[PDB]
Amino acid sequence: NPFPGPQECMEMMFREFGTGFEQSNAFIQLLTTLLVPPEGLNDSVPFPEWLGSSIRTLGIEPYVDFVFDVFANRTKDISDPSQLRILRLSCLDFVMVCLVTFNEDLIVLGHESNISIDDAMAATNLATYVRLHPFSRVMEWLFNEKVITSLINTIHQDPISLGSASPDSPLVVSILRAIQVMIKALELQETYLHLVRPEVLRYQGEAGVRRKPVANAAYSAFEDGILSHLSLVVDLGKYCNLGHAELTLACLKLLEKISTSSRILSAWSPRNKAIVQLERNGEGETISASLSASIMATLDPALAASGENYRVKLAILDFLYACLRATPDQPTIAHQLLGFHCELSKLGIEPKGPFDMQKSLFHSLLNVLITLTVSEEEQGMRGYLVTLKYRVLRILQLLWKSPLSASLVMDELRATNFLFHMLLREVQIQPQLPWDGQLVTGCEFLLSDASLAYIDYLASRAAIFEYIGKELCSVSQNRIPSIKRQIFDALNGQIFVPLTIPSIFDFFDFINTDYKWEEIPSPHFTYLKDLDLGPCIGVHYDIRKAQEILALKRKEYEHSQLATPEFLETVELEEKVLIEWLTVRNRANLLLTARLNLLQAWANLLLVMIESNDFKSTPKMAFLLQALQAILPTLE
């Protein structure tokens, strides 16, 4: 009643506060600040449940509705680009503050066990939370064409502006916020369409609510509204040459999620559109060149896990892995970025191209891999180097297994002596060399993160052995002794360019039963002994399945009213021991399967070597006896 009905006065005041930019931005900031709870950034949604109960209003929805209507329609009356950028940034921040304040796991567990197991008392609380929280309205607005059009217009800008702009420029911050909102929407679209739409529809059908739809029924998902924009990927790729770590990581994650989808790649390749869009003015070439220049940039030894360069490298590697693992038979953008001529159900190399001159992304990866040393002195056997090489080897294996990109890759590898570089980069493992300053025999080893690096190193050795065996089989079937001599010399322990290297029998040091990975010390467990891991269990024992059971048991014991305060610490320490027991069992299973895979790879390599061997046997009798001596204790 601002001094005329309230439904009219409120909209009149909102429209009055919409004229201009200063007052609009100030109101948006005020609303964003008010939406923050007093405890800071989970229940008790930050607003009174009786907000607007007197008048026939939907609560706090009108505010978000007006904000979205403004951001969608009145963005053309702003001449000053700075004001428009500030308004878009404020709207994106408001949307993010509204989305981040939504419970996902809570609603999932509710819809799962509340009505099916728990009573019907708390159901009303979750219902009111889902009905009053503005997340549903934001998601509904996200399916509008105006919103995505404004977003892609804001993200589509000239490169000169971003180049001459400052890292703290509002344009970069707005683009980052928009990418984050898009990521959150792509993550929560399924949860929404599953546990919001039906409940809201049922409530609207039962009770009396007057709401105006703002979503498009045709857009069954968020990808339907964005699959019509081809310049988005081009802009995301061009924005990688700016140097901004956060923006680069966001763009890489967005491209990875896009390549991971299915409808987008079904619409693109039902000839194709992306390959021709990225080959308009040589965008792929410059993108590959920028990626190569980036991965070649060194890292900061002190800021191992904080070096933005290493983070960008890992993001690019994850993107390539996800793009190659998805739909390997049909080519993708990864093949074009590597320097291949992506043709319909066929690949090829062009003359004088970047991949022909051995200057491309794949060759850059090969170089940075062969010029990488993991053997250190101060710590020795670092972890992040191991992770990097493991990712590189996974990408190489994904490229090799694909028969569409196997022959050319094997040719390019054998034409540069990659196996020789790998062997020269090999390092022997012993129980004395610690992992990141920590010894293996220590009990904390199974609890520390060194297990991941150990599994990665085992997988790397297995992949190297498999590649060596495949190359040996190829050279044998090709009936050419020009390379067989060098292969045997490398296996004999000599190199003629003589440089010596440890033989294959030297690397047979990963089979050791002294650690007793199978045996586990079982504590007394005077209580909770009957709690098994039935619902916990692909050997993967979930911890929540036992956490809920032990919590229910503790609640029952407390309700029994028999020395509940004293014996609580016993149950607490038993749970703290059981969680580490489960983690140790999982790590032991992982180590066991890794050792099994490595042993299988080594056995296959040895079989391929023994079978395809025309060299005399009397000289190799020494190696035969050595292998027999080495396997004797293993069999025993």
Partner: peptide, 9 residues
């Protein structure tokens, strides 16, 4: 063609 890929330590 192989400026640095050579095995010349």
């Amino acid at each position: 063609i192989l400026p640095m890929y050579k095995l010349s330590p």
